[PDB]
Amino acid sequence: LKPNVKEIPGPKARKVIEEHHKYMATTTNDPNEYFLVIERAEGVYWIDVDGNVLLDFSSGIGVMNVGLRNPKVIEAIKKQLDLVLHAAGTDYYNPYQVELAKKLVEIAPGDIERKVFLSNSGTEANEAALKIAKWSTNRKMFIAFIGAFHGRTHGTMSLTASKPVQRSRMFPTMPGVVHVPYPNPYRNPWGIDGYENPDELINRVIDYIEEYLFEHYVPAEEVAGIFFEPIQGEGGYVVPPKNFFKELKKLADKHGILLIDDEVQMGMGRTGRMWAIEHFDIVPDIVTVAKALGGGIPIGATIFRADLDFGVSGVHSNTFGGNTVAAAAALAVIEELQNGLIENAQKLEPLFRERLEEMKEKYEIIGDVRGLGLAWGVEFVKDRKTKEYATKERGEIVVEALKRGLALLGCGKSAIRLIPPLIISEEEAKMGLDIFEEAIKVVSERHGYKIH
Amino acid sequence: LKPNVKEIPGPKARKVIEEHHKYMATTTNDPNEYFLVIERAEGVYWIDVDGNVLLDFSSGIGVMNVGLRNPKVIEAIKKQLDLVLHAAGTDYYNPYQVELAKKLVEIAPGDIERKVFLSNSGTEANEAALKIAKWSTNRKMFIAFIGAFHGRTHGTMSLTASKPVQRSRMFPTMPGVVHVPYPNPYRNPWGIDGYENPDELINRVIDYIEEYLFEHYVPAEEVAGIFFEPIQGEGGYVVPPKNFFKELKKLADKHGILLIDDEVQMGMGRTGRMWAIEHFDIVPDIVTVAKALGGGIPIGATIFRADLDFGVSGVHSNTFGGNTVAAAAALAVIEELQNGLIENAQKLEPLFRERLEEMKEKYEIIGDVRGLGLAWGVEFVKDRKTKEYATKERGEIVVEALKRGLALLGCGKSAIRLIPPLIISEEEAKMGLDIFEEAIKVVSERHGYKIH
Amino acid sequence: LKPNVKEIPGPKARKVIEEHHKYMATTTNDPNEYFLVIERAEGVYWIDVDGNVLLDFSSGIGVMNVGLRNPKVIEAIKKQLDLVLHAAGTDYYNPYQVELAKKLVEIAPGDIERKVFLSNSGTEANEAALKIAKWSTNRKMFIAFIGAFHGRTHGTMSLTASKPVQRSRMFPTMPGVVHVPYPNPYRNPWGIDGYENPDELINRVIDYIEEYLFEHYVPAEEVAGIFFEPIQGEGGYVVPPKNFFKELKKLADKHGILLIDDEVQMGMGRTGRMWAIEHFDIVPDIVTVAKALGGGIPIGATIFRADLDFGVSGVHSNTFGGNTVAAAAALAVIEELQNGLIENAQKLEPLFRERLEEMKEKYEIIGDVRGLGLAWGVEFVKDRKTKEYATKERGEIVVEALKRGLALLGCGKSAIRLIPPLIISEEEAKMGLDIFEEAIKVVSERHGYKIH
Amino acid sequence: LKPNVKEIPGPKARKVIEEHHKYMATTTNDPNEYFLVIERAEGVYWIDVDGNVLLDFSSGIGVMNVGLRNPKVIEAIKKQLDLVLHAAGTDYYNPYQVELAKKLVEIAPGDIERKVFLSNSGTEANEAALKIAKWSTNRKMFIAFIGAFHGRTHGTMSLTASKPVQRSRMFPTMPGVVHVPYPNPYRNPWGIDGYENPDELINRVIDYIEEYLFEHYVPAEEVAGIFFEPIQGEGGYVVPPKNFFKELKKLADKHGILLIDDEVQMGMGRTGRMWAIEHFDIVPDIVTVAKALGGGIPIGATIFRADLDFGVSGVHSNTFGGNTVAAAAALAVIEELQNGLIENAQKLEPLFRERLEEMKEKYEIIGDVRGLGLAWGVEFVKDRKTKEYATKERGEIVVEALKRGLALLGCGKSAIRLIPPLIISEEEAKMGLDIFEEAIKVVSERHGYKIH
Ligand SMILES: Cc1ncc(COP(=O)(O)O)c(CN[C@@H](CCC(=O)O)C(=O)O)c1O
Ligand SMILES: Cc1ncc(COP(=O)(O)O)c(CN[C@@H](CCC(=O)O)C(=O)O)c1O
Ligand SMILES: Cc1ncc(COP(=O)(O)O)c(CN[C@@H](CCC(=O)O)C(=O)O)c1O
Ligand SMILES: Cc1ncc(COP(=O)(O)O)c(CN[C@@H](CCC(=O)O)C(=O)O)c1O
Hints:
The structure is a homotetramer.
Chain A: H1 11-23, E1 38-42, E2 45-48, E3 53-56, H2 59-62, H3 71-83, H4 95-107, E4 114-119, H5 122-137, E5 141-146, H6 154-159, E6 177-181, H7 198-214, E7 223-228, H8 244-253, E8 258-262, E9 286-290, E10 300-305, H9 324-362, E11 366-372, E12 375-380, H10 391-403, E13 406-407, E14 409-411, E15 415-418, H11 426-447
Parallel strand pairs in A: 3-13, 5-6, 5-7, 7-8, 8-9
Antiparallel strand pairs in A: 1-2, 2-3, 4-10, 9-10, 11-12, 12-15, 14-15
Helix pairs in contact in A: 3-9, 4-9, 7-8, 9-11, 10-11
The complex binds the ligand Cc1ncc(COP(=O)(O)O)c(CN[C@@H](CCC(=O)O)C(=O)O)c1O (4 copies).
Cofactor (chains A, B, C, D): pyridoxal 5'-phosphate
Binding site for pyridoxal 5'-phosphate (chains A, B, C, D): 122-123, 265, 319
Keywords (chains A, B, C, D): Aminotransferase, Pyridoxal phosphate, Transferase
């Protein structure tokens, strides 16, 4: 199996795309932009409906970090289909979910007292995390960061501030969320070159929260929780300065406010550590996780400081959570991660770092490259000084990449996210990076961007 | 397999129950009322970790309608595991999510243009129904029923109204929900015997909404929707009057207000019909479903009039939506309902109708029996005139039923829900009712309730 | 002065009514129901711009309790105009605001520690009661009564529940208000004759709050207050059962919930007692007042248990609060109430009780008469059994009353409020009732209502 | 009458301050900081209870712009006491309120179609302005600026973001308000010297709204209204760059969003023009006004684009609004303003400008002076580079000023506002400025601030 795409969209793929519009809601699908109709997968390759074969650099939106069809994960589901699928894990008990909870507690950030709530997705996780914070603190408000994307349900909508379309005629969602600039070292309201000047940018963010919220309109003692992603994912895959969460805890702790680390995307080994937050050297009180945890099965988890746990029964619960198939799959994923995959993403870090700083130098359309492990984001600006978003160009590059057999996804207004399965070999990476470049190169020539 | 219980909880179950309290959040588990620790299942029975075997009348909180381990479903899954698990349905198209989506619209109540938004759970369904209701109507408010349960996320909790604990310390949740008395024929504020006088109670519930909301504090034309359960799942299995939803649509259409019907529990032919609402001869604008459709797999589904689809991309989306594994399970589950299982639930309806009216005639502790198909709800009262809840007694029956090999669920303050798998045989249905009557009989004697 | 009307509206009034529609916002003026253009006043009568003279039974919407132009009040003002008008009471202290504040606590219902927050109006009073309730209890929610009116600011409108138009296009207003049926003896959802069966109706209204809010969707211990009018001013002058507020305090104390009584209309001895609540033998934690206390001057006053005072400075404040001109008028107004005017309203109560029961016996259009002191409310019904509002007819009576020299106010959908100044003589009280009966009689004949 | 204070607080003033604490709510009073107990006034002098005489530089918190006891204003109230005090100006009509409305429309900013709503205070005005905006646009959200102070009621609380104490345990207030930095040329999150670099600062504010709200979490088409004060008053009396509202309209108009100019403090001639906004060369759609409009009587007005008016009756109204005494007083104030006072504040502008830039040069404790007409704010910083607030020093200066006979008020965290009556002579000003300096001088020596 090598990349091989004779034509796309194919007659079969064209018929699915017609049908999908007949019977399915307008979500985030894009007929022209993302005409990829998957029928099966193998290793790091999607096999489409018309037979075209594409190297994967999307990993099912980060859902698959172990691979697109992990053997150990399908054996674990098969083995768990034999005993029990569902055991109402919130009314009755079952050991599988307890085995997962104990494992999740174990691998949590830091070395502190933890408990675990189970969910079916990242939005449910972050909904959980909200209630848990509301209950334990008896405070009702929350800080999130502009660019953050925590979900699409009425709690997480409030928290999510990536695209105003997300909240189109949704107002009002859950009250008490206030937003401040994320320390985005490429776009922040201060013009600050956050790579050259990280402490200057860290300070401006903190100084905003302290001086322009707490001192004016936000009672600091009324804030349950600060919600952050350790790398904004949907927000264009943004890496904030190394010493940012350390400075943020300092300010959190000074007003007895919870830190909530949304690792729905950047967790499960993606950045060459179990959790994204470790690189930033802080122990979050609540850690939410989903996507990659279920290795292709729907699963969500909320990991928290044990003393934050719900006083009484019937505050929160869910029928679906605690499903055995998902828990069987999860334990297996975490085993795959600990036994090779997490080391592999640290191994391929310097390869994506060199090859993308190569592309930075050469293609003037690229404004910024950034990432950790196998979590990368290239943002494409029309003009480097102006930093205007090349949204149209980004779409063209993805389409071009798809034509050449590379599967990519667009995060943010003007960037593309490289997130292959953590199983990818050195020879499968160089292939993706080679294809990716050739996509930029074509679209660069097409529009008269310099090529140094 | 037969029912076969020695010590429950046995020594392995006691160890699991301990481990659960240590690692896992405080939810709706009860070591003292629901001490059932499930290792595996076959046919209609649970096998616990000590090897005790119990007849199922809980059906995993109405999720295993097709059986606790259906052969058709597990084969449909394992076939799909050979192809692909997750395929980024929100961003990329696959045929499986389309087939399921297409299938769902076809089986939907009435005969009108429908589309479908795939979700991960009941709450993730009703959350979606909210946003569809909001976006389509460009109205922000909803009506809901006291006694209703629609999920535990910041949207749905405004909608939910079963127990205050559910909303404890959560305010504010989503604004704009106003609630009103569900036409419970047994408990309503007007005292009305709703079984005897079903029109009088319908008028009252309607009179309230028109005269007390619409004429005083709730602008009719600013209401985006009315969420109702056709039978309240966590409300004690309250069955409304047959002409209720008819009267409620007369009112709804008069002000352009969408009627949303929640079938997360009573759906998938639980009541002897594919959709619970069908018994009531009305067509809802939205239908939400989860639980049973997945058939042991987490699944979500919001079915709506094509008119209400979001005009633009990026209003609502989800990473796990349209799971191919889940879609494969769902289609298999649907076939079984149409090819035997729905018929079997019409067939066994009279048995329960008989045996549970035999039980009310005999045991004074039983205030009201009610149900359709294989959805039954016995409510237990201290006195038949004052109707004080027999909460302590209801919990004892559940514990007694369990020491005699019957998995039962509480539902409401003082009632028990009988919801066996729709694959249950006549002989297995009698066996479980026998054991159910015995558990009432024990707890009746113990407390000196009358036995006629 | 006598009543004396020729053309109303006369040619100067028509010119003013035109100028008003041109320069001024669309509020609660009605050229077609309230075409009364006031130039000056003396004693108990209005003189209009054409020199038509009308007997007053409106009392400036219950503001001129002491008369339309009281000598004592105007002297108290002009004496204060010689000293100072505004003195920055919020920031600087003056003796006048303290004297009035001290005076207000002394006259307050019951005998407990009280303080006072001076405001500018009824809404600015109840807004204050909210913040005092919130700050003191550290609870965010309130209960209120369907039919209630408490003002038209973003706090109070949640509290208010008289007409939807009041809340049209305003959502969201302040969250956390839940409403319930006021124990109207004439119109309630249970049908109960509350005059006949006042306990049955009290139980119902109480049963609703306990069983339908506190037991299902409203955590009792998260309710900061219950706002009630002792008689609903814009609700058609509905007089609740005498033992109602007693039962409601039993419940309120059981959950630590402040009972707030609004006397913005029924206060200042309107009902023959200084405070309207007094008739009901309970002591409210907060008492709000405005209108009549000012005596032709804008004034606001929130009276509360000393326990609930804000711990810190800068939570609540207002620039115009504690106006010295207004305080001088208020003290003068209070003296009159205690030195003649409250007595005069007890004295004239039987007259209205007679004449309006004589009118109900005679005119079939009259569904219900009700009132205390000099607060009377006739409600007009199409039919006495169906109780459909006689809205069109009620408006005609007001117009007929006015062509015969009687200023009257609508109140509720189909009723009229009789609220003359408390300086009204027995002879002036008979005259206005005679004219009132005549206006009913005309509109009865015109529409073929029965005359017994 | 000259400044003359032998001792303060006096034995009489000490007794009032004791009593005030017995019977009055904790608001913004400060026993130690503002021990000024007014008994009467004359010209520009307060006469305290113990006989001490103080030149006024507070003007009753900006309430008196015509003087502390204007003759023309007391003659107008006296003349209006004779005819009518209250005439329920929202139910019935009266020419006085129409005469005021017509006058207010006339003197409004720009030359456009206007209507007028009447209120009792600035909070009611801004509550009005909210509803009017909500109704006309059918949008529910609003932008205000950090530092803004629009009121203390549940709508205006949301809008007000000056001190977090203001919102202490108040959450939730009205949803949908979002806040952005005010272009404060001395403190903004960008460090921008707004006097040297106004366009750079204007852009950063606009660029924040456009790029960090509209493009991320705030749908621009869902924003009814941008609320601004043309000089932040309570926020330390801050003058934003001359071309700021012009750039803000540009952005407003591009998304069909209303501009709401809160002139409650800076209006009624205070800045040497009728309205503060004129200096900034834009025509606001809604203009709110109170305080100075009533010349010592409680009055509020909301002036708006006529096509924004309430479609239907009963959306908004108030019992108090339209009071004749206040309207009589208002017309008189506006006459005083147009016939000398507004020219006088333009005359004394260069005198406060020179004498305060004198004080800037000499006293290192002064960080910034700023203002227009007779609206001035001196902010005192501990260190000029650091800009730390000298809150304690500010209190000392006010107390010191009070001791020497000068009446001042503290606006913001570390500044004092000079706002004498517009009637003040050149010789009464130099006196105030002389006293003010001597207060700074003393406190400067006391603490070892340089004196150049
Ligand atoms: C922080 C965060 N929260 C929630 C989710 C997904 O919530 P679910 O509960 O699984 O529905 C994601 C996935 N990030 C995706 C989200 C795409 C979308 O929701 O449209 C991304 O890569 O943008 C996420 O990164
Ligand atoms: C109407 C409705 N909505 C939502 C849900 C659950 O949403 P999920 O997304 O599947 O979690 C249920 C299940 N009713 C269960 C609820 C159990 C609980 O949450 O405590 C019941 O029958 O008690 C339901 O009946
Ligand atoms: C309980 C209550 N609160 C507040 C108010 C009015 O607050 P203000 O601040 O004095 O405006 C009223 C007056 N009831 C009037 C209301 C008129 C109206 O606003 O339309 C009435 O009798 O209709 C009232 O009864
Ligand atoms: C913008 C604005 N809104 C409202 C008000 C006052 O609202 P009322 O309706 O009159 O109560 C003021 C007065 N500015 C004063 C406010 C002081 C205070 O409210 O504590 C000031 O100078 O700080 C104001 O400047």
